[PDB]
Each structure stands twice: as C-alpha cells, then as structure tokens.
C-alpha cells in the first residue's frame, strides 16, 4: 500500500496556516514586512490628512454643518468641536479603513492562532490594546455618515511599526550595536511623531499651530530647551506635553539600558571586510 | 516643565517667595534624587541576573515542563527544543529552565526570537533551593529534567550535584515524574527512584563495543533517538544523500495491536509472520512486543510467539501510526560486579580467574613469557581500546563483546591501552573474561600500538580522555585526539578507528583528505537544515554516517525523547545488551556475500529470514565507491621516496627494533552510511551489512 | 544658551529656515557628541593610571 | 574572530584572499597545544577555502 | 624557504652545495681585494663566497 506521513497535522486548515504565519521562518519576515510597511502607510496618510486641511473655512461633523471657529484668551473655556471634528477626506477614509480592517482581522487571527493559555496573555499585552484603540473606532465609523470625519489617533501606529521593526531585526538583518541604535532612532522618531501630531491636533482649538511649528516646538521640548516662543496655551495641550514628557523618561531609559549593555559589546568584535571590497581590493 | 528642566516661561513665578520656592524646590531635587539614583543603579546591575519568574496563574493552565541544568549552553539547549517540540503532542508545553548561572550571550538571542520567546522561560536559580523550585512551579510540572554537566573539572562531583538535585526535587515535588541523566555508572543506583535514568558511561561504552561487531551501531542508535520528519537532504543531487536522509527519519513507536491499522489483521498469527507482512505491505518494521501480563519488553520474541488482542507492538516507522493516512569457556555470570546495579549477563568465562599478572601484555609473568600479541598468536583480529583510566564504564565495553549469544570462535581479543595503570578493583571485574588484556601506553607513540598488535587489529576504539573534557575552547577538547587519530589514519590506512569526540562539532577535522573538496559540499547540505531546524545537522558528515565518530551529545536526545516515549530507554538499553530480559533478542549483523546476491531486494531478504531463522532486519550498512659512487644513488633514491614509502619505512623499522616480524604489515576509497528500515524494494548491493535482531537462543 | 539646553527665549528663531536649523543643529549635536564622549570615557579610565611627567624645564633647575 | 569558525572566515573573505598566514603563538604555556591550534586552523582554512595558498608557521618538528 | 633550508643543510637535494667557511690567514694576505679572492676560488675549487665575517679592534 501507499502511505503518506504527517498528513494528520498538515491537512488541517488551522495547522497549515499555523506554519505559514508563525512556524515558517522565511514567511514570518514576509508577513512582518506587510505589517510594518502598512503601519508606515497609515501614519503617512495621517500626515497627509492633517496637511491638506485648513480649518479657517469651517469645521463640522460631516456633510453640511461646517462653520468657522475662533479662539480668544479671555474666555477660559475650550471649544471642544475642533478637537474631535476634522473634515478628513473621502479617499483617505477609504485607504485607511482598508488598513484598519486588515490589521484587525490579521491580529485577531493571530490571537486565536497562538492561544494556548486562557487568552490572558494576549489581551493584556500593550501591543494588542494599542491596535484596538486606533483601529476599532475606525471600523465602527463605516456605519454612520456623521462619524466619518472623526479624529482617531492613527499616528500611534508608528509604535506598532517600531514593534514590527524590532521583531524583524531580532532574526535577520533586513552589526549588533548598530541593530540597537537604529531602534533607538526609531523610538525617538515615534516619540517626536506623536508629540508633533498630538500638539497639532490639540492646538486646533487654539493657537492653530501648523504641522511644522508643532514639529519645531516638539524638538525644543524633547531636547529640554523650551524657548517659550511657541507654548501650549490650553489645558489639553498642556496635559499632552506633560504626559509626553512622562512617557519619555519611562520609554527612553529602557532603550538606553540595552544600548549601554551593547555599548560594552561594541568595544570588541569590531570590524568586517565588505563583500564588495573583496572583489577589487 | 520645571523638574524636566524645560522651563518654557509662559507660566513663571513673579513674586519672591515663589521664586525662592522654585529655587529651594530645585535644590532639594539634586540632593534627594541622586541618592535614589545611586541605589537604583546599584540595583540596575542586579537586574541583569536572576531575571524571570513563572507566574502562579500560568502554572494552572500552561502545562509547563522544567529543565534543571547546572550551566546552559547553546548546543545543549537547541538539541532539546528541537526535540522536545518536534512532537505535535508537546506544542502547548512551556519550557522552564532552572540554571543557577546567568544566560549565556548566545543563548540570549535564540530565546529572544519570536519562536522561542513564547515557549521558553529562563529563571536563574538552583534546583537545590526550594525558594527557586517555587518560581519554576516544580509542584505543577509535567516532567523534570536534571542534566549532569559534562565539561566540569570533576566528573564524580558533577554527578553528586545531580544526585542531590534529584533528591531536592523529589521531596519538594513528590508527585512529579523525574528525568535524570547521570554521568558515571556507580552513581546510577542513587537516582534509581527516578522514572527514567540515562547513564552516559554505561550507554556510550556499550555502543563503542558494538561498532566492533555490528559496524556503525552507534549511528543506528543515534538516528533512532533523534526525532526528525525525514526530509533532510531530499534536494541533494547525490543518490545516497537522498535515500539515506529519508530512511533516517525512522523512529521506534509503540501501539496496542488491536488499535493499530498496521498489525490488526495478524491477530493469532506468529510474531515473525506479522513482522514480515507488515514490512511487505506498509514498510514498517515490527521489532518487538510487550504483553499485557508483564511489563517487560521483548525484542523479537520469536516465531513461537502468537499475537494477542492485549499485546503492545513496538515498530519502526517514519512517523507514529495515528499520524498516518493509510580451551573451553564456561558460561556463567561474572562474579565481581564493579558497581551496584550492574546488569548481570550470561557471559563467556574462563574456568579459573586469570591472575592479574597474566592480564598484562608488555611484561610477562611466570605462567606465560609472551610480551606482545605476536607472541600470543591470536586466531582472531584484535580490538584495541585507547582509554585513559579503566573503570566501571570501561567494564561495560567488555560485557557486550563477551556475551553468551556471540559465537565462541568469533571472540575478538580485547586489548586496553590504558594511560594509567588499572586499579585492583577493575582487574577483579575483568579477570574472568577470556582473552581480555591490558597494557600501559598511549595512542600517540607508535611503539605501544605495535606492541599491542595494531598490525592485525580490526578496530581501534579511541575513547575520550576524561582529562581533556574540561577544556575551555571547543576545539581544545579534541585538538590532541584528532591529530593523534590523523597520524594513525596515515600510518595504518586499513585500520578502522572509532573515535569518541568531546564536542560533535569537531567532526569536520576527522576525515580530512587534503586533496578532496567534498567537505565544502557537506556544509551546503547543513545550511539548508540549519534554516529548516533539523535535529541531525551532523547527519551527513562522512565520519558520523560511516560510524567512525560518536560524541555523547548524540545520545542526550534519548532522555528528552523518553518523555513522550517511556519505552525508548528500555528499547535502547535492550539493543546494546545493557539489560537482558529473558526471552528478548539481541542486535546482530550479517554480511551479504555474492552467494546471497540472488536475493536482489531487501524485501526478499526479509522473507528468507522470517521463514528460516525468524531474524528481523532493522537496517543496512551500505558501502560505496566514492664507495662514493655507490651511495650517490642512495641520495637520489631516498630523496625521491613518496610519503607513503617514508611512513611504511617507519613502522617496519620500529617493528624491527621492538622485535616484531616485519612481515604482515602490508587504502580507504569507501563511502558508508546507515539505512534504517529501507523500503522492501531497495536493492542489495555487495559488501552490504544488514543489522538483525536475532531471537533469544534460549527461547 | 541653546547647546547648553537653557533656552531663555529672549532671542528665538521666528522664521522656519532658522527654526529648521536649530532643529537640525540639535540633531547633529546628539549624534556627533556622544561618539566623542564614548572615546573620551574610554580614555577617562586610562587617565587614572600612567599619571605624571617630569617636565624637561624642571630637570634643569630642580 | 577565530579562523576555526566559518562564520568568521566569511567576514575575512578567506575564499577571496591571495594568501593566508597562520602563525603559532610562541609565548603560550603549552607548546604542543599551541601547535595543534595551528594544525586545526590550517585544516579549517583549507576546507573552507580550498583554492587559497596557505602559509603556516609551526612550532615543533 | 627552500633556499634557507638548503643553506642550513635542513634539506639535501642531490647536487646542491653546502654553506662552508674559510679563515683568511696571513698566507692569503697577498689577495688584497675580495674580488681577487673570488677569482682564485672560482678557478680552483669553484666555491662561491657569500660574505665576510670581519673582526676589528674596538
Ligand atoms: K531649558
Ligand atoms: K534643560
Ligand atoms: K527654557
Ligand atoms: K539637561
Ligand atoms: Na530519526
Ligand atoms: Zn601469570
């Protein structure tokens, strides 16, 4: 007779794609290249979205009711309309929501795929909740017209973009100390990115800060310089710089610790003869 | 924005008390914070070590397994995870690691990759402290693996570290299956309470003692205890690397006969009838069975045995069945066993215990005045063992060679080339065995081996020296033994040298034909398995596949595999004759000559044996084809002599000097590999050696 | 007052090229200075030993 | 990096070199073990870069 | 390596010479120049002088 081995496991639909998603080494990086480039894509579309809008002509929920908004210092109250409402577009809605659903189905598939231990580990991890808070509100926005032009912190996907990138460099190279300072550059990029986008959006109520002005401000803040020509004048932005400072001293020293643990390793094992040099030198 | 030293200036103190307050609030900051920082950095360094803890909530659900090692290395860990997780039944299990030392630098990343990050948990801590057995949740584990440290300076003290660790884990977690790997055979009875004990010295020496009878036995038992899918080297262009890499996926599996699809129909028929017709129909080799009445396992119980509905069947197949689609020598027991728990075996014995003076070779005694194997005039070819210190482990090299089922006339004179003089405790054990001699010396010097009789020796087993195992660098352990063997490979090309390597990675240095470039090709075969994550990355090495090199890192997998297969230690120790259950067969070998060449196929060979002698062939050891005017010419001749002539002139001159006859001295273009359970359609080329499990002669 | 991370704010860049310059100047500082610091601390430990030298001018008189 | 590890023979591009110099260590405590370090290093570089001229300085005859 | 090992006699190819030495005495002092010494040897014994071990009064 003819007998084929290991058919019990591979024939199953779950176990076949278990190998594709997790077990296979080559496929894993291809999958992560899909997620990391997607997370960059949704962050870039965010930067595009804030770029082409001018709230001087009117801010509304969606459709007809849009009116110009003004800010005055004497009134100590905040107009909360511009903080939540933004006339993002029709197409940036489309491309971004495709990313939102794709990320949700991909991760919830991984949730069930890797579940072994009473699904306590998966839900608690910070990587899971971060994706929920920046995709789930963006999935329910399909249903209603007036909730299409609603602000969602989709800039936070740079953190999961960084998380995808470090899960990449763990296995393959595409040095060792260079493999960490590269990640330290990324978290500085993500830390600035949320600070720039967060201050820009929170300052839609007052000071109407541009995207570049917020970027300059966000750099002179994380460098502890703080000139004071550009400052937050309203309490949400004041809270944001406070909470943006606090995360900095709790996310950066951890990166610094592993970097200095690799600073000592950079002293030895130094040098490599490039393959391009060997062909000619 | 003040304590972060930012200080925008939109909100500032305008009146002097508040200005003083920010000044005094700043000043206290630089005097209260650095003190907290100092103790934190004093604890920053402590966070590097002692990292990890297994949460009590996880233990109730995760179904983990603990591994108490004394020092974890990259080679030892990846031989375990690639084996512990090679079974589908164990994909859920978490691996906890209780290593008292901190994580090795190269162990960091392999535990950081996403595959071995959600599975492996590392907790720095000793199993001898109950405070660290609570972290690993030893009371909740499904198995506990204690592994002895092979590369320590003290080998009898690295064994007591394991006896106490087996004791500490037994009184803290009494209801937990214990798995111990002990180093020396004398300490094997102190861990007898453990469910599964594997002894390095008892198992290793008994396999180096089978390469002399059945060649490459240490390789057959190696690919059997390594769990692999069976797809290594299928992309190879070479024909043998395709088939040999396929048949090396055969493992020993067990099943109840009635639930087996393979053996169901042969209920009530003879065991040899079921074994042959299972191989003919499906290709599985049924080596032995265990009845329900007894707990003993019998290898090839014989033709008289009749199958039953209750019996358990042990077979060799690529995967488990459920994962398949469709003077006179007196015969007696040796009186003086050197250690407690030594297995009693029916052996060939001299009628009177030989005196200690009669065992020694180099200096004769009053009874015999012979001084070398030439003077003794042995009828059969010798067996030379170049061990360092004769002990309890070496005694396990002699019992399989002297066991009763071996033919009396085929006995090979065992000669031990001990670096140190054997103690009177060891001589009392071997004084009963026939034609077992010893002589001080080493494998490096040439005179000692010539006195031993290396001219007419079939095998020279070079046992690893216990002194070199503690070498710091990997190559430094076998730097001397590889070169010393490489000297004898040139001097004696026809000799069969079996070498024990401290580290398996040193196989590349072993064969080393300088002109041949096949060593580069053998690495390409390993790179694709390295990316595929296969157990036997060393499988395609020329010395290993031929049975010439055996490291004990090959049989560490016997313990981890025993977790899913509780019979593997008994099956292995039955093949080597380490334990002898009455009615169980023994591993034999047969040479297929041209008189048997009419049996073209391996299946037809199975039919002939299972109808005449009821011997069950396991596999095939296949070999391939891979006055100034007078001395003026003496100058011209002695200058142009080839190295083969220079080496030949060296041994002959030494034999002249020591007194041995120069005659009889007067080469390996051969490739060998081990096919385990080949399909019944495989051809039987000449010079084939077929492993057998012959039934017990006293059945 | 910018490279000392003080930044009073009495003198500030008001136009975006200068704002970019201080941003890019802060970035290059954070990437060129730590490299100099690393070799300096690698030589900070060497300054503890091999300390001292007797000046040639001192030997002529002292 | 050690010449006995092929991972470090790829960095040095041993397959591309015009000559390989292995020099034994004269000032080690063991002189017959500082020679076996060189025999194995001559063996390791020979099977990784078979077409490369080898230059060995051995200590003992 | 072959030239050096030939000068020290470490290897002996048949037909190859060996490194020797001669002491210039006062009986040879009429050979003032090293060149004239080369002429005498290359016409009588065919020995090729490599160099000179010169001793002084320091
Ligand atoms: K400042
Ligand atoms: K500052
Ligand atoms: K400031
Ligand atoms: K500062
Ligand atoms: Na196998
Ligand atoms: Zn005697």
PDB file of C-alpha atoms in Angstrom, chain A residues 1-9 18 22-23 25-26 32 114 116-118 120-122 167 169-171 176 217 220-233 238 241-242 245 249 253-254 257-258 261, chain B residues 1 4-11 44-45 47-48 57-58 61-62 86 88 91-94 103 105 108-109 112-115 118-119 228-231 253 262 280-282 317-320 322-326 531:
ATOM      1  CA  UNK A   1       0.000   0.000   0.000  1.00  0.00           C
ATOM      2  CA  UNK A   2       0.907   3.696  -0.269  1.00  0.00           C
ATOM      3  CA  UNK A   3       1.221   5.726   2.931  1.00  0.00           C
ATOM      4  CA  UNK A   4       1.967   9.451   3.236  1.00  0.00           C
ATOM      5  CA  UNK A   5       3.417  10.679   6.512  1.00  0.00           C
ATOM      6  CA  UNK A   6       2.356  13.556   8.779  1.00  0.00           C
ATOM      7  CA  UNK A   7      -0.921  14.043   6.904  1.00  0.00           C
ATOM      8  CA  UNK A   8      -2.777  14.281  10.232  1.00  0.00           C
ATOM      9  CA  UNK A   9      -1.410  17.743  11.031  1.00  0.00           C
ATOM     10  CA  UNK A  18      -0.025  27.939  11.616  1.00  0.00           C
ATOM     11  CA  UNK A  22       4.478  31.505  12.839  1.00  0.00           C
ATOM     12  CA  UNK A  23       6.444  28.302  12.243  1.00  0.00           C
ATOM     13  CA  UNK A  25      10.989  31.369   9.288  1.00  0.00           C
ATOM     14  CA  UNK A  26      11.056  32.789   5.754  1.00  0.00           C
ATOM     15  CA  UNK A  32       6.025  41.373   9.069  1.00  0.00           C
ATOM     16  CA  UNK A 114      -1.243  31.402  19.223  1.00  0.00           C
ATOM     17  CA  UNK A 116      -2.700  28.245  24.465  1.00  0.00           C
ATOM     18  CA  UNK A 117      -3.032  29.757  27.932  1.00  0.00           C
ATOM     19  CA  UNK A 118      -6.568  31.022  28.652  1.00  0.00           C
ATOM     20  CA  UNK A 120      -4.996  36.148  29.407  1.00  0.00           C
ATOM     21  CA  UNK A 121      -1.544  36.788  27.924  1.00  0.00           C
ATOM     22  CA  UNK A 122      -2.705  38.007  24.510  1.00  0.00           C
ATOM     23  CA  UNK A 167      10.679  41.832  15.761  1.00  0.00           C
ATOM     24  CA  UNK A 169      15.837  42.719  13.345  1.00  0.00           C
ATOM     25  CA  UNK A 170      15.683  40.052  16.070  1.00  0.00           C
ATOM     26  CA  UNK A 171      16.101  37.280  13.489  1.00  0.00           C
ATOM     27  CA  UNK A 176      24.816  44.179  16.590  1.00  0.00           C
ATOM     28  CA  UNK A 217       8.161  73.001  19.251  1.00  0.00           C
ATOM     29  CA  UNK A 220      12.860  72.058  21.519  1.00  0.00           C
ATOM     30  CA  UNK A 221      10.754  70.256  24.142  1.00  0.00           C
ATOM     31  CA  UNK A 222      12.316  66.784  23.979  1.00  0.00           C
ATOM     32  CA  UNK A 223      15.760  68.414  23.922  1.00  0.00           C
ATOM     33  CA  UNK A 224      14.770  70.093  27.232  1.00  0.00           C
ATOM     34  CA  UNK A 225      15.431  73.505  25.661  1.00  0.00           C
ATOM     35  CA  UNK A 226      11.967  75.065  25.784  1.00  0.00           C
ATOM     36  CA  UNK A 227      12.480  78.553  24.365  1.00  0.00           C
ATOM     37  CA  UNK A 228       8.886  79.605  25.019  1.00  0.00           C
ATOM     38  CA  UNK A 229       8.071  81.396  21.760  1.00  0.00           C
ATOM     39  CA  UNK A 230       5.715  78.508  20.931  1.00  0.00           C
ATOM     40  CA  UNK A 231       3.939  77.137  24.001  1.00  0.00           C
ATOM     41  CA  UNK A 232       0.673  75.322  24.746  1.00  0.00           C
ATOM     42  CA  UNK A 233      -1.950  77.790  25.967  1.00  0.00           C
ATOM     43  CA  UNK A 238      -0.587  71.373  28.496  1.00  0.00           C
ATOM     44  CA  UNK A 241       3.267  67.875  26.872  1.00  0.00           C
ATOM     45  CA  UNK A 242       3.186  66.701  30.495  1.00  0.00           C
ATOM     46  CA  UNK A 245       7.375  64.217  28.847  1.00  0.00           C
ATOM     47  CA  UNK A 249      11.528  59.214  30.867  1.00  0.00           C
ATOM     48  CA  UNK A 253      15.862  54.769  29.684  1.00  0.00           C
ATOM     49  CA  UNK A 254      14.789  51.216  28.822  1.00  0.00           C
ATOM     50  CA  UNK A 257      19.860  50.385  29.197  1.00  0.00           C
ATOM     51  CA  UNK A 258      20.005  47.797  26.424  1.00  0.00           C
ATOM     52  CA  UNK A 261      24.544  46.817  27.583  1.00  0.00           C
TER      53      UNK A 261
ATOM     54  CA  UNK B   1       8.166  71.692  32.863  1.00  0.00           C
ATOM     55  CA  UNK B   4      12.122  68.306  33.440  1.00  0.00           C
ATOM     56  CA  UNK B   5      14.484  71.315  33.089  1.00  0.00           C
ATOM     57  CA  UNK B   6      12.385  72.584  30.170  1.00  0.00           C
ATOM     58  CA  UNK B   7      11.115  75.888  31.552  1.00  0.00           C
ATOM     59  CA  UNK B   8       9.099  77.372  28.691  1.00  0.00           C
ATOM     60  CA  UNK B   9       8.398  80.615  30.547  1.00  0.00           C
ATOM     61  CA  UNK B  10       4.703  81.061  29.748  1.00  0.00           C
ATOM     62  CA  UNK B  11       3.966  80.350  33.425  1.00  0.00           C
ATOM     63  CA  UNK B  44      20.448  48.176  37.849  1.00  0.00           C
ATOM     64  CA  UNK B  45      23.398  45.769  37.788  1.00  0.00           C
ATOM     65  CA  UNK B  47      18.569  43.262  37.284  1.00  0.00           C
ATOM     66  CA  UNK B  48      20.831  41.718  34.626  1.00  0.00           C
ATOM     67  CA  UNK B  57      -1.592  31.807  37.390  1.00  0.00           C
ATOM     68  CA  UNK B  58       0.330  30.429  34.400  1.00  0.00           C
ATOM     69  CA  UNK B  61      -3.159  26.355  32.713  1.00  0.00           C
ATOM     70  CA  UNK B  62       0.063  26.403  30.698  1.00  0.00           C
ATOM     71  CA  UNK B  86       9.312  18.020  17.426  1.00  0.00           C
ATOM     72  CA  UNK B  88       2.723  17.579  17.874  1.00  0.00           C
ATOM     73  CA  UNK B  91       3.349  22.096  21.140  1.00  0.00           C
ATOM     74  CA  UNK B  92       1.384  23.514  24.102  1.00  0.00           C
ATOM     75  CA  UNK B  93       4.060  22.863  26.740  1.00  0.00           C
ATOM     76  CA  UNK B  94       6.174  25.660  28.217  1.00  0.00           C
ATOM     77  CA  UNK B 103      22.011  33.427  30.448  1.00  0.00           C
ATOM     78  CA  UNK B 105      25.301  35.683  25.447  1.00  0.00           C
ATOM     79  CA  UNK B 108      20.067  35.406  24.773  1.00  0.00           C
ATOM     80  CA  UNK B 109      19.044  35.854  21.139  1.00  0.00           C
ATOM     81  CA  UNK B 112      14.588  36.301  22.017  1.00  0.00           C
ATOM     82  CA  UNK B 113      13.338  35.217  18.572  1.00  0.00           C
ATOM     83  CA  UNK B 114       9.516  35.055  18.373  1.00  0.00           C
ATOM     84  CA  UNK B 115       9.530  31.254  18.062  1.00  0.00           C
ATOM     85  CA  UNK B 118       6.529  32.448  23.879  1.00  0.00           C
ATOM     86  CA  UNK B 119       7.725  28.902  24.696  1.00  0.00           C
ATOM     87  CA  UNK B 228      13.078  14.118  12.555  1.00  0.00           C
ATOM     88  CA  UNK B 229      10.434  14.412   9.855  1.00  0.00           C
ATOM     89  CA  UNK B 230      12.635  12.531   7.389  1.00  0.00           C
ATOM     90  CA  UNK B 231      13.122  15.216   4.716  1.00  0.00           C
ATOM     91  CA  UNK B 253       6.990   3.826  18.031  1.00  0.00           C
ATOM     92  CA  UNK B 262      -0.677  -1.911  10.595  1.00  0.00           C
ATOM     93  CA  UNK B 280       5.932  -6.086   2.923  1.00  0.00           C
ATOM     94  CA  UNK B 281       2.582  -4.282   2.934  1.00  0.00           C
ATOM     95  CA  UNK B 282       3.243  -0.933   4.640  1.00  0.00           C
ATOM     96  CA  UNK B 317       8.236   3.809  11.049  1.00  0.00           C
ATOM     97  CA  UNK B 318       8.740   7.308   9.675  1.00  0.00           C
ATOM     98  CA  UNK B 319       6.022   8.688  11.955  1.00  0.00           C
ATOM     99  CA  UNK B 320       3.533   7.455  14.530  1.00  0.00           C
ATOM    100  CA  UNK B 322      -2.078   7.869  14.436  1.00  0.00           C
ATOM    101  CA  UNK B 323      -0.363  10.424  12.170  1.00  0.00           C
ATOM    102  CA  UNK B 324      -0.601   8.132   9.120  1.00  0.00           C
ATOM    103  CA  UNK B 325      -3.178   8.448   6.347  1.00  0.00           C
ATOM    104  CA  UNK B 326      -3.321   4.751   5.412  1.00  0.00           C
ATOM    105  CA  UNK B 531      17.420  27.143   8.233  1.00  0.00           C
TER     106      UNK B 531
END
